[PDB]
Paper text:
Comparison of the active centre of Z. mobilis Tgt with the modelled human Tgt catalytic subunit reveals that Ala232 adjacent to Val233 in the bacterial enzyme is replaced by a serine (Ser231) in human Tgt. As this residue is replaced by a serine in many bacterial Tgts too, it seems unlikely that it contributes to substrate specificity or catalytic activity. Nevertheless, we introduced the Ala232Ser mutation into Tgt(Cys158Val/Val233Gly) to investigate its impact. Kinetic measurements showed that the Ala232Ser conversion further reduced the catalytic activity of Tgt(Cys158Val/Ala232Ser/Val233Gly). Therefore, the Ala232Ser variants of Tgt were not considered further in this study. In addition, crystal structures that were determined of Tgt(Cys158Val/Ala232Ser/Val233Gly) in its apo-form, in complex with preQ1 and in complex with queuine do not show any significant differences to the corresponding ones of Tgt(Cys158Val/Val233Gly) and, due to redundance, will not be discussed in detail (data statistics and PDB codes of these structures are provided in Table S2 of the Supporting Information).
Transfer RNA–guanine transglycosylase (Tgt, EC 2.4.2.29) catalyses the exchange of a specific guanine base in tRNA molecules by a substituted 7-deazaguanine. Bacterial Tgt functions as a homodimer in which the protomer consists of a (βα)8 barrel harbouring a Zn2+ binding subdomain close to the C-terminus. The reaction follows a ping-pong mechanism including a covalent Tgt⋅tRNA intermediate. Hence, in an attempt to generate a model system for the active site of human Tgt and to gain insights into the relevance of particular amino acids for substrate base selectivity, we adapted the Z. mobilis Tgt active site by site-directed mutagenesis in order to mimic that of the human enzyme.
Author numbering:
A (entry chain A), B (entry chain A): 11 to 109, 117 to 126, 133 to 383
Write the structure that this text describes.
Amino acid sequence: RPRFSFSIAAREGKARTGTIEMKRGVIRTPAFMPVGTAATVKALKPETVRATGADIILGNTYHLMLRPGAERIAKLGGLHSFMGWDRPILTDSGGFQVMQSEEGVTFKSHMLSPERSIEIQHLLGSDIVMAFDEVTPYPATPSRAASSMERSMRWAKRSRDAFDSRKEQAENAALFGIQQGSVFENLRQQSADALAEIGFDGYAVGGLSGGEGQDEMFRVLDFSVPMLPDDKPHYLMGVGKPDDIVGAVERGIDMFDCVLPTRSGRNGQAFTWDGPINIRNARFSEDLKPLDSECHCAVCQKWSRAYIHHLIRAGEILGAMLMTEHNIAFYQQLMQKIRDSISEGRFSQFAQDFRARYFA
Amino acid sequence: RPRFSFSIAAREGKARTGTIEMKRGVIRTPAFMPVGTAATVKALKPETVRATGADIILGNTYHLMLRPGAERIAKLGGLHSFMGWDRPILTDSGGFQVMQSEEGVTFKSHMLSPERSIEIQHLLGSDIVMAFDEVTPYPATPSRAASSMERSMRWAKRSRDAFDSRKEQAENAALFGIQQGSVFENLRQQSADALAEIGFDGYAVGGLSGGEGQDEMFRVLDFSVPMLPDDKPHYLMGVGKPDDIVGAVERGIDMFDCVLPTRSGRNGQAFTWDGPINIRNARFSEDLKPLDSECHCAVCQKWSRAYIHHLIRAGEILGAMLMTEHNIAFYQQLMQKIRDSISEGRFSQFAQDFRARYFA
Ligand SMILES: NCc1c[nH]c2nc(N)[nH]c(=O)c12
Ligand SMILES: NCc1c[nH]c2nc(N)[nH]c(=O)c12
Ligand SMILES: [Zn+2]
Ligand SMILES: [Zn+2]
């Protein structure tokens, strides 16, 4: 396998399905990345993450640099070895957790800058490295959005140069740039233009899911995604709810990460094709059905709603484990249905059918 | 398989190795039972419990009756179905958690008595049912020890009769009686005599590990175990540390349960053949070795001390999972080495070698 190759196998409107080939494996797009905060997808062994269908997971640069430490992980062999996940890993850059000077930022639990962020991602042994950016809070005035976007584009060039100057990283990993500009079309365009002039392996749409709500997010995606190079992956960071994913794919997004399936699983929320359920609710106390009637996951093959209800109410670790496994499996099944429907030219109908039942 | 059959395959001194055949499976003795408090061996799926070598697990009557409820579990199909463990389950009776009238006891989180305890164990679908007893606090005066023992023997007969009057339970489960009498040889003998006159499928030594310490516990086992019927299993409830298990087997015990491997795993203590380690200690922060150098468990095949150190310090659920799996696997490997050494007539040497290295 090459360092990086993205191929589109089929299209429907703005939606695409295809593959990213990297040295540690192939990633089927559109892809959902389970989030490994501190070198673990919470409550799951890596084999279990893989069994659900995940091709790639996300690691958080900010958190890993605080504990256990980036240099410590490198000394121990890198993140893949440390946590026992041998497939691709994408690492975010830290600009979200940060949300200061033109050089970068210092904070108390440390320093982050374009150079230091790329270096930490190198120390971890990341396959997909994200450029270090400045993330504008929503809402943002035009002036502030422009200033943060301009800074982010200067930092994208510094990110690019830091990555390239590290031969081992440049030869074996990929680097993605991050579009900014808040909700403003002209800034989004300036940003896209700047990123494409520098050139990246992939392009994230940054700055959304920051409080603007789905309508506004979709409106911004409507004009922002066509500004990115068509022949590279489009990554929407920190999204999201199933309906957010479907609608973002309808608008050209190829990759996703979110803590929702994991976090909400631990809290008692299970995803189903008829919408999420609150497993702690009394209505589930003697319900022998699985979490979801169609789900192929091991949890739904083996345990009832009633049992998982008990586990979560009791604070048992196995409750977290089962909820999380199901939720991640559900998310992967969603992505698989999206991939198959696009390849078969029936994604429009899938989205319609999905929504009518999920929000019945 | 029969309802119940215990066969001794080999002996060395007072130590025995053999099998208990029951309808849901065979139990290799000497046996360690992982404890499932509230319908879960904490942090482990039942398949993982089985993969470690466990033949049987313990369920806590007291806790299950409080949450989720005994009648609720019966309505849902019984404990095996509820939690997804299809092999034998032993349930304790509640007399430990209780530690009042001659009829039984009422308390606030409910009622327990010989009849109600046997009924709850029936509702759960237990394979090995324990008689309901009264457990004397240590230390106990001779007079108090005698009174509690006498009461326990009256309650053993009531337990026996309740079990027998329930045809389904009598035909498919086994009933074990519990010897009491504190540290007093004459009371222990009276108790053994009373239990054997009633007749049970197995005999537990109750009332120990209550603060008397290992020396005293071993002294009491020295005279108490020979009082029990030789041809039935001998169960030491709530024991224990590896060296406690070895010494109890040297004195004729065939079965064990304890929360130590699970509880102490979650807290950061890993068992090793050179003794327990505190994985949170700084000395493990960059240690690439497995938890134990010889352990065959999946955790030690795959992850380092350093990683598990990180997980436990971070409060991650996977830390609990890995620690627990290892500790239960260690305990099963201990039991396997005990079984093999007795069968091969080299258990004396094993015990000696085990102790010299574990306490080096
Ligand atoms: N949801 C927006 C977002 C999530 N994670 C992010 N990480 C970075 N560097 N930048 C961003 O804009 C975002
Ligand atoms: N360690 C003593 C002990 C543990 N669990 C027990 N359960 C019962 N019924 N009786 C007992 O004496 C004990
Ligand atoms: Zn499922
Ligand atoms: Zn191990």
